Symmetry: D2
């Protein structure tokens, strides 16, 4: 899978998300060449780039113009983006113009996490998956509470990753920052 | 991906490998529908199940008869096990009778870690990957060194995981023991 | 510092608090021989013990009768307790009957966290510290919010500890569950 | 305890040791006002500083000339050093001119870990304590082996610490690199 260092970043644009995390988001998302997925807060584009090649169509949304721009750049360098619709705009309004979805990945909550999830539940085909990524503490709580309030079966997994860096003196373990995945069962 | 709680267990068989680990093992290995893989120490059968439904033929090895049994039981539970050759017995003697592999996943060291890897290097098809899962401090070290000594490009990723357990009082974070993954380039 | 395995553990009562966490608690508490401290949810009695041999007076509270007994037993085995006042009853009602404190440690709340902090803030001597342990996801968010909402500068440290366990096969890394410490500036 | 940001950091000297780790080290070292201690690879002087205030004497050693300089700098800026014999040079040679030690803390091995531990065992007074800080994957293993081969009861604790950082968005957990502590039975 495309390792972190292989992605073009940006100052005002966070990401890419740790490969280990991206790897797990895909395992939970349970892709498919016939699935329609939406990725909110596509940021650097990691999550979008991955899905761009395992489903029918992916809607990448992000209020920050730089993010939509940053994702596009990576999509182009990897020659992907055919089944990807970029959307410059607020998440709630961006979602309303989209068909029902099979997969839903919500990155940077954007302080609109609750409203964002509410909408997603109204457009979730049967057996749909909803995966919420969280970097902020307050975000994990809100993600559990809302998804629960919408009648979903919420689960949460915290991932503390450490990779080894080759030094002259030997190998050192470099830590990533904690990343929790709040998701709904099938 | 089959969640941990959906596996048939055995009071004498460890495992199955944490899902988050199973997931990352698959991202790294990058299974092809034409690859020949071997899983030393299949234990409960996690990794074996995951490879089974993605490659041509998987050779699942294990010293414990209960293991071969449990793995075979979880195989049938998901309509898989046609392209899986089970092997009871010591790894070294089992590995020598095997054809060349594209993917090598070695589970619990077994005290013969260094010998196992050695046998695998001479049986690895060009472009093959070797992945070692370690829970023991010493196994992590011996893997790194030995793989380097055999002329491979080694890397190590440690995963401390925490899952949420619903309690009356709320959600608790329960962690799994650290799992390191020592892998080679391609 | 009294190591874990040296405490009388009652299966029904939680604890003792991982020695590593207890160490960090004392470091953040900055106990003085003239300080007055209260420990809500003393449980096994780990924290109470540490403070007992370091402050003027320690008020140990816990709504569980077995926790009080367990805490009393352990204190005796360590000749401590001569300057400790155990309390049988609910926290909130037990807090109003206590003098003002310099050090407040709060363990297992019980859905009464908000109220418990509200009382501790009112009885907190100037300069005093407030330290809250949280194993529940929710308690972490709640302690962070309530302490902030009560006008305190809040800080949070997550501890993921792994100790080594010698096995015939080698050294296994055994992980304790995550433990957070939410505290107010000194 | 002296926090991280309160230390004079030199661009050529590593450290200071994370306050959470220093706290644990002081806990395992069980400092006594009579104990004679030695800090190998004092770095910024965090460990030396702490000890200087709780034991008879302290011999801070470090191959790096700038480290010695930076360590002597943090001593004065806190009113300590009247009992801190600084030493610039190779640890092994430096230790020979030192008295028998009660407490021994070793960090930077510079690749002479084994030679250092051996020397320490010959100078270790009964009831003495040895504590090694490992950052390199290889160091942990080596330390375990030597200490076992020297007739000591080895113990290892892996610490993964995360501190919360205040963002306009709210609160994120920032990870520190893993830090392992290999210690002998007192």
């Amino acid at each position: 899978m495309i390792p972190d260092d292989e992605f073009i970043k940006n100052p005002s644009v966070p990401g890419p998300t740790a490969m280990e995390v991206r790897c797990l988001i895909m395992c939970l998302a349970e892709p498919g060449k016939n699935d329609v997925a939406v990725d909110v807060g596509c940021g650097t584009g990691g999550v979008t780039l991955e899905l761009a090649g395992r489903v029918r169509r992916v809607y990448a949304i992000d209020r920050n113009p730089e993010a939509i721009s940053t994702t596009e750049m990576n999509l182009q360098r990897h020659g992907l983006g055919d089944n990807v619709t970029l959307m410059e705009g607020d998440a709630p309004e961006a979602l309303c113009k989209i068909p029902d979805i099979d997969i839903a990945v919500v990155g940077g909550s954007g302080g609109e996490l609750q409203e964002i999830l509410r909408i997603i539940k109204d457009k979730l085909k049967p057996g749909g998956r909803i995966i919420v990524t969280a970097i902020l503490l307050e975000t994990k709580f809100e993600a559990m509470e809302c998804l629960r309030d919408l009648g979903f079966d919420v689960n949460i997994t915290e991932l503390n990753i450490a990779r080894g860096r080759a030094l002259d003196r030997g190998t050192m373990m470099v830590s990533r920052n904690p990343v929790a995945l709040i998701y709904t069962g099938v």
